[PDB]
Amino acid sequence: LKLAIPKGRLEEKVMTYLKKTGVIFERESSILREGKDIVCFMVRPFDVPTYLVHGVADIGFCGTDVLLEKETSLIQPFFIPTNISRMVLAGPKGRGIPEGEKRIATKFPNVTQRYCESKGWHCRIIPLKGSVELAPIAGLSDLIVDITETGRTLKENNLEILDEIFVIRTHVVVNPVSYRTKREEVVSFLEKLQEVIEHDSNE
Amino acid sequence: LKLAIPKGRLEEKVMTYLKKTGVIFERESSILREGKDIVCFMVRPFDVPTYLVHGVADIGFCGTDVLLEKETSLIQPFFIPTNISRMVLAGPKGRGIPEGEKRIATKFPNVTQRYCESKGWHCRIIPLKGSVELAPIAGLSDLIVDITETGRTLKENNLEILDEIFVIRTHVVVNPVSYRTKREEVVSFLEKLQEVIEHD
Numbered sequence: 001l002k003l004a005i006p007k008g009r010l011e012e013k014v015m016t017y018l019k020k021t022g023v024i025f026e027r028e029s030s031i032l033r034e035g036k037d038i039v040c041f042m043v044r045p046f047d048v049p050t051y052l053v054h055g056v057a058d059i060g061f062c063g064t065d066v067l068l069e070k071e072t073s074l075i076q077p078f079f080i081p082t083n084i085s086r087m088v089l090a091g092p093k094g095r096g097i098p099e100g101e102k103r104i105a106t107k108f109p110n111v112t113q114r115y116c117e118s119k120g121w122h123c124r125i126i127p128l129k130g131s132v133e134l135a136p137i138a139g140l141s142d143l144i145v146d147i148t149e150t151g152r153t154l155k156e157n158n159l160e161i162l163d164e165i166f167v168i169r170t171h172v173v174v175n176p177v178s179y180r181t182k183r184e185e186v187v188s189f190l191e192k193l194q195e196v197i198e199h200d201s202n203e
Numbered sequence: 204l205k206l207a208i209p210k211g212r213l214e215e216k217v218m219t220y221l222k223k224t225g226v227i228f229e230r231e232s233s234i235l236r237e238g239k240d241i242v243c244f245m246v247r248p249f250d251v252p253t254y255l256v257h258g259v260a261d262i263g264f265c266g267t268d269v270l271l272e273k274e275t276s277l278i279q280p281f282f283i284p285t286n287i288s289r290m291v292l293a294g295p296k297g298r299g300i301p302e303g304e305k306r307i308a309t310k311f312p313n314v315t316q317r318y319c320e321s322k323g324w325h326c327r328i329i330p331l332k333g334s335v336e337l338a339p340i341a342g343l344s345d346l347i348v349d350i351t352e353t354g355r356t357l358k359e360n361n362l363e364i365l366d367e368i369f370v371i372r373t374h375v376v377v378n379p380v381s382y383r384t385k386r387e388e389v390v391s392f393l394e395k396l397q398e399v400i401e402h403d
Binding site: 002007030031032041042043044045046047050051054056057126127128129130131133134137138139140157 | 205210234235244245246247249250253254258259260329330331332333334336337340341342343360
């Protein structure tokens with residue numbers, strides 16, 4: 001089994017689940033963790049789906065933000081409970097929402113496009129790579145769509161949450177092809193993972 | 204004047220240069236530094252061009268990589284000479300270039316697409332966000348197009364350089380609108396900066 005693990009925020013949770021299921025690594029680097037019958041590809045979160053879709057990994061993990069920002073046909077075998085953070089709409093405190101076309105800066109343009117559509121809004125979406133909270137103060141946009149965990153970064157930049165778009169959690173996704181060619185091996189691993197994951201997230 | 208400063212690797216050098224011109228900050232945060240007449244937006248390198256539009260920022264700094272990857276209409280008066288790094292074609296040590304279609308992973312798909320066209324190659328480009336050196340190792344691609352500085356990340360992953368695409372330098376870029384509406388002030392700053400670059 002080859003796994004695509006999301007570096008960053010979800011990295012320790014996922015690796016601890018793997019540790020809890022019995023996985024042991026003999027050789028470890030920044031990009032690659034190798035054990036008997038198991039190899040972990042440590043990749044950027046948005047590259048998880050790519051590794052699976054291209055078929056070089058069997059199972060992968062990513063947050064809801066990745067899953068909703070880039071649609072794939074990956075299979076989600078089960079639900080991982082813990083809410084890690086939230087995707088919200090935010091803008092300069094007290095100033096509300098623009099009447100006409102809304103300028104929204106974000107790292108998640110598709111998510112943002114989808115949200116605007118559901119609101120019947122006219123939006124002008126400005127894609128950014130990070131530090132999205134700087135957009136409103138610089139005059140680049142009126143609002144932003146971004147992730148928040150406690151609201152600290154928004155608060156400190158005097159932005160306020162105007163709407164909660166979706167709660168973000170960790171997801172397990174499986175390469176369809178692997179699901180059929182290594183069926184019992186994948187089922188088995190997935191059963192143990194779920195056992196461990198259920199426990200971890202709830203108790 | 205509003206400046207778009209690339210966060211990260213080039214940050215303090217640029218800030219030192221600004222400091223040498225006579226900039227004086229009154230308030231400073233991780234994403235914004237403001238003082239009499241000059242405001243700095245500390246943004247991701249790839250976002251520098253996106254802030255140099257309409258009336259948001261006036262002058263910015265970014266690598267050749269950003270400029271060649273993203274089609275921009277920016278005025279480019281000059282650049283900072285230092286050879287920070289290089290955009291290269293790389294692959295597993297000894298394997299060379301695969302015949303026919305080459306699978307290339309990269310964080311710079313447009314650059315790779317242009318590169319392949321210039322070689323007459325049929326390529327299958329796989330965009331990645333980071334740790335591009337893992338692709339060849341994992342079997343995701345045959346080759347990579349990525350930035351190298353010391354060559355250590357490539358060398359320690361048994362990847363060798365197959366071709367130097369371009370040297371990367373820090374370009375000074377200016378919003379065309381700003382160059383029209385704040386000509387004197389933009390030019391005044393650029394001369395002070397160009398003098399500091401030289402001396403240094």
